Design a protein around this nucleic acid. Structure first.
Length: 55
DNA sequence: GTCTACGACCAATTGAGCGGCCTCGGCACCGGGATTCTCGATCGGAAGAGAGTGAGGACGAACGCGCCCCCACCCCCTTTTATAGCCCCCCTTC
C-alpha cells in the first residue's frame, strides 16, 4: 500500500507520508495501528463537508 | 497416569549480516511561464411589493307589504207589549 501511495504521488522512495497514508487509508491497518503515531507522517487530507462553502 | 517428542543445553562450524566505504541520481529547491481559482463587479435568469381588472359576496339599507295587538266603542244578544203585512212550513183540498 505504501508503494502504491508513492506512485500516486509520483515518488520512487517510500517516505513517512506514504506510510501514514497507507496505514490510515486501509480500514484494517488503521485499526491495528489506531493507537500508533507515525513520526513525520502527518494526517489524512480530510475536511468536514459542513466547513466547505455553499452556493 | 503414562510416555516419549522434541526443546534446552553444548560444542564446533561458518556465511549471513553489520560497520565502513563509496557514489550518483532521486529528490528539492528555484524560477519562469501557464493555469486555476477566487469573487467584486456587471446584469441574465427567475421571483416579490405594488397596482389595476374583473368581479361578484354579504348585508346595510330602503321600500311595501303583510300578521297580531288592541283601542275602545258600536252592537247584538236577551226580556216585555201593541200593531200589521209579509213570509215560510205544514196541513188540507183537490
Amino acid at each position: 500500500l505504501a508503494g502504491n501511495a508513492a506512485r500516486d504521488n509520483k515518488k520512487t522512495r517510500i517516505i513517512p507520508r506514504h506510510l501514514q497514508l497507507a496505514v490510515r487509508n486501509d480500514e484494517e491497518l488503521n485499526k491495528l495501528l489506531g493507537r500508533v503515531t507515525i513520526a513525520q507522517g502527518g494526517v489524512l487530507p480530510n475536511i468536514q463537508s459542513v466547513l466547505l462553502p455553499k452556493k
